[PDB]
Design a protein around this ligand. Structure first.
Ligand SMILES: CC(=O)N[C@H]1[C@@H](Oc2ccc3c(C)cc(=O)oc3c2)O[C@H](CO)[C@@H](O[C@@H]2O[C@H](CO)[C@@H](O[C@@H]3O[C@H](CO)[C@@H](O)[C@H](O)[C@H]3NC(C)=O)[C@H](O)[C@H]2NC(C)=O)[C@@H]1O
Length: 129
């Protein structure tokens, strides 16, 4: 499913993502926008054999099992396939686990590049959240 910006915002707010580990809502909308363009079925293969999965583009080397990534750890304890569903429950739960590591929201290259040290007010504007 390709989420509408405000449709996503409402779904993340409802899942407790606003302030999750000190990361306000606009941070998560900004990273979903630039990581996948709000598409839960987005996939991206890397040089090293790993693949990025879903709306938050979670890597198969540490967080999920896709059966073709060499030396993977599956810390989220899921199949990567579970990150591409229209239903965000599993993606949210894994993303929640990703920001608990020391690097936090800095784990996401799109966040560091287009959201970090920017005015993200516009990503939630008009959503009524
Ligand atoms: C949001 C997702 O999937 N992001 C992960 C991933 O994602 C991408 C995704 C797309 C790209 C693209 C398109 C291009 C490009 O150049 O790079 C990418 C990296 O690749 C990073 C590789 O460094 C991971 O970051 C690395 O990931 C784990 C998660 O924490 C680390 O292991 C953990 O390291 C910390 C030390 O800080 C410990 O606390 C824990 O022991 C440990 N493992 C566990 C299980 O928690 C490691 O350090 C950290 N790497 C560095 C060098 O930043 C980050 O998680």
């Amino acid at each position: 499913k390709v989420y509408d910006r405000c449709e996503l915002a409402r779904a993340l707010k409802a899942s407790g993502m606003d302030g999750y580990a000190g990361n306000s809502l606009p941070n998560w909308v900004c990273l979903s926008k630039w990581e996948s363009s709000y598409n839960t079925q987005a996939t991206n293969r890397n040089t090293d054999g790993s693949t990025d999965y879903g709306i938050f583009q979670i890597n198969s080397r540490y967080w999920c099992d896709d059966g073709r990534t060499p030396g993977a750890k599956n810390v989220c304890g899921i199949r990567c396939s579970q990150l591409l569903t229209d239903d965000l429950t599993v993606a949210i739960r894994c993303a929640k686990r990703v920001v608990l590591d020391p690097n936090g929201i800095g784990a996401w290259v799109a966040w560091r590049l287009h959201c970090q040290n920017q005015d993200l007010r516009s990503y939630v504007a008009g959503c009524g959240v």
